[PDB]
Amino acid sequence: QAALRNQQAMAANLQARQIVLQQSYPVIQQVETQTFDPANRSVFDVTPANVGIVKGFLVKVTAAITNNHATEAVALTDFGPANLVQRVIYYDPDNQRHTETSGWHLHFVNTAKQGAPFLSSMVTDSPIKYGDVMNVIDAPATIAAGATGELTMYYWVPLAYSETDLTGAVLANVPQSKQRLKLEFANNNTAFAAVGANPLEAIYQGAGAADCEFEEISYTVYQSYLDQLPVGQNGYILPLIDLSTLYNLENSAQAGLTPNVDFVVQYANLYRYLSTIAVFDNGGSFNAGTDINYLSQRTANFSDTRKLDPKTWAAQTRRRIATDFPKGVYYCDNRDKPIYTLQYGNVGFVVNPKTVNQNARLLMGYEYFTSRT
Amino acid sequence: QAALRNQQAMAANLQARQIVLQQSYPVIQQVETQTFDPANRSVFDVTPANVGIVKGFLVKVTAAITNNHATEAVALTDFGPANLVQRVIYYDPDNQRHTETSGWHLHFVNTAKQGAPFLSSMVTDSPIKYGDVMNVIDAPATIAAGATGELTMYYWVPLAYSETDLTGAVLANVPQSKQRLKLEFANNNTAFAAVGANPLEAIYQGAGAADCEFEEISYTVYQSYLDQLPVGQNGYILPLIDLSTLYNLENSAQAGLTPNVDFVVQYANLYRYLSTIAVFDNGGSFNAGTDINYLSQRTANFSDTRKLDPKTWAAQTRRRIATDFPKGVYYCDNRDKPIYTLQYGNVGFVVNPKTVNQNARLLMGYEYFTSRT
Amino acid sequence: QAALRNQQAMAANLQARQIVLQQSYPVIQQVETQTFDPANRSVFDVTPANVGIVKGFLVKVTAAITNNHATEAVALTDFGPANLVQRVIYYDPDNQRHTETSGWHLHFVNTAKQGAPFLSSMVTDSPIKYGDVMNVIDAPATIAAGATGELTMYYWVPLAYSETDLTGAVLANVPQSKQRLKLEFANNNTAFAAVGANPLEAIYQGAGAADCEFEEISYTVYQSYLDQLPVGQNGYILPLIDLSTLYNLENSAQAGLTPNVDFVVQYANLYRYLSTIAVFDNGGSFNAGTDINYLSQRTANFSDTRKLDPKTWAAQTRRRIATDFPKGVYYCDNRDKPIYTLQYGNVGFVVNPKTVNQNARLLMGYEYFTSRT
């Protein structure tokens, strides 16, 4: 029977993973640093090193922003420094595409995976001076007229699903085939939004936005990988299922929302969706659930497995990340039982809006597994 | 002789639990919503759905409170919106009671099980606008004279011990049996305490309390259960030990405290106590340990397993929920090694007070397992 | 080869550990309490009880500090009340030394092991009055001229590695035992640093420091151990490897730093280093990474396994303890793969400074396993 072959192949994959993790040599190492002015260039193609099993990339981004307006200030948007990177794209040595998503979606996934705001500093009552000492992720709440602010942001670009689950990792042992990590950074057009404009992709918004400009952006890419891979009789001990599976983040935009009607976003088939993020960009307005009747995941036979009002939806998210996502951002965890259908559209994500402004749209971000072939 | 029969029956139960969790698909859906004026009615009986394996109920409570006093305001008590529900009682299909406890004890257990204040929003230094966006559990610190405040509270009523441990869950396949979830809500008599009165059960206290009233109370009950239970050769694959065990929360009151003398609350026998909460209601005064010499758990043979000063007792609790329970509330975790005696009164919970005001009492809250037969 | 014997002995050690943890009687009880004036005495030798397997000691320290200066105030140092204990040393019944380290290093390890500032109270949006109720660890941020402040501090002195890993525990059944816990407390010379002086070891610093004095210090030592050890056919069931292993905390000082040059602190051999703490005492100045180029761990010729700038180094720490350590404190976790070297100097901890003041030094704190023989 073929079901036993599967059982055997998965047991062997798990065994190989455990052997690799036990015997391999975990390394994190810089591969590239660069400082630039986004007025000159904002898209960069980073070439990682071809060594061992690649697990992911830590992208450090710093920036200096000057407000040269005469009188008016500017204030952080909801996403703030998470919009320093507009887009990230990874291609493996076979030129197979993995993650392609926005900076803010990648950041929200980093938060979901950590269980708390990514790389944040928790506030406590400790008299010992713990706290925001090193400003790992940091941005001034406002930039006054004539002032210059310093920003720092970190993104984890995952290939492997986690430090102990190598599903999605990349074997980069061929010298000639090239990894490609594409970073598209913010610039003076995307980062600053005037009053009344849509702040989705911007870092600061306010009456002084027209006279704000980047002084510089700097990035440093660190590559996390496993060296000194174990070797056995038949050859390198490798988890074949893990290394032949893609773990990808992607996002898309959907429109056509109308008040009091279910707006359904179908899940594709053959993808194992681990998480879903839905941002209700209600025509440049981001509200704390007040413009939604309910959200749900639905099988299409009218059976809702979790049809909830917005506050109760947020309650489940508070159990995942110990806080709320920013206004208009809704998270759905399916990690223990991924959405997996055999026929396209057998499951959908549902938002029933109560208020729909002009140009309202739903930005969907997905976390999923899929096989190469 | 029969130790293997036990071992076998336990191995079968565990395996069946894993199969049920693996093959069934979890569902959470609304079962009842109602708005009312506590001046007319404050006791309600919710009728859950009889489907699959029932794990628990999420009770969302919203309320509007108006301070009609001319000049004086009111402020939250230590328990605040946790007293929106005064009492909860659950009857399973076979008319067996599970949880029967107060709202504040249920909330403190929800917190203990989460490892942090239930459904709270942690504060961090993140510049990304995480935080208290959705006001999942919320209540104004004060309600000024003439003002109206909005409250939201959530309670999880557990049947199953947790999402992965179905001990205590309820099989709702029986045709002739109605579950009963009984909820007693706060009213205009319990929710508001005058200056100098006992705030234990109240939501607000202050000089304006006599003229405070509910505008309205609303509740929504969600039921969490497992559907599509797996079927095997003999029939449904079910963990018989899990479904024949009761996971209950209960509360009691004890009086007779006198300064500098050990006040002992005996644990009953046949119950496997998982946690203990002791509230020192010192005649309407709730103090931060300054009225207690020490607390302990003690066996009949005179041995103290943890006789500690109140600060050190609170230190262990800080390792459990990352903060302190409100003033006068003391928590004891026995989940790894439940208090389980064969003879009533073999083990007791000890409080040695140093100050005892008139009408002092110890409100006990218990979390325990027990068998149906 | 006979390496099978190891396999068997370790499987037997883990089996004996599991049996002891299941059958034994966990107890935490007070062994000594004393109030003293540090002007008279600040060094104490605590004699624990000789019962069962000893896992560790919880040291509660309270203090009253008066600022007698006429006009000036004092403010907490970065380490603050963690310097109430200057040094702690444990000797087992065989007079073998286990932990020998400073108070601040012990506290930082307690924090690393908890995953958050040790015994801290997290801040949340909860309206229920959770929070800093009991002041488990507490110290006023400043003490005004003429004012008296009250301090409370807790240290966990570990013998066993954790509550479930008895590696490092001590068997205390032999009479004529020399079990000794030595505590060297702060006094009126170490606790108070003048402006411009080195605040490393002090609790308060400021222009009023010269006139600050302890009114009193009090300590209470609790001993955590296992009673009622199980007895088998051959005799007492004991994990021989666990009880013959030392789990120690130690610290040392290192000097000879020069700008832009790698300063390497070699790891000794035969020690299994679990964690490393490095404090850059830059001549009494403690900076948030701005005086360091990068930190790293490095092999003889296998290069750097994690060569990172200070902010990225701090990012990894934020994933461990949900915040930053105080200024100048850098943490490195090696718990899953301890640094174990066949030959001395095979591995080293590296700091490359960019600014080195006079009398700069690197205070190293280590967590490690080692065998008795």
Ligand SMILES: CN(C)CCCN1c2ccccc2Sc2ccc(Cl)cc21
């Ligand atoms: C898929 N299902 C297992 C999830 C049910 C989790 N469910 C829960 C369970 C155990 C303890 C506390 C809670 S609170 C809660 C709050 C909001 C929501 Cl939406 C659900 C829950």
Ligand SMILES: CN(C)CCCN1c2ccccc2Sc2ccc(Cl)cc21
């Ligand atoms: C009763 N026993 C099983 C628990 C001992 C736990 N014990 C402990 C152990 C390992 C690391 C840190 C700590 S802190 C602590 C603080 C207060 C109290 Cl009361 C106990 C402890």
Ligand SMILES: CN(C)CCCN1c2ccccc2Sc2ccc(Cl)cc21
């Ligand atoms: C420990 N290293 C060897 C493994 C890479 C961990 N790596 C990581 C991995 C998975 C998810 C998020 C992160 S963030 C991060 C931040 C700073 C640093 Cl220094 C590393 C990481």
Ligand SMILES: [Cl-]
């Ligand atoms: Cl009504």
Ligand SMILES: [Cl-]
């Ligand atoms: Cl003295």
Ligand SMILES: [Cl-]
């Ligand atoms: Cl680390």
Ligand code: NA
């Ligand atoms: Na250009």
Ligand code: NA
């Ligand atoms: Na709130």
Ligand code: NA
């Ligand atoms: Na009334």
Ligand code: NA
């Ligand atoms: Na405090």
Ligand code: NA
């Ligand atoms: Na002095």
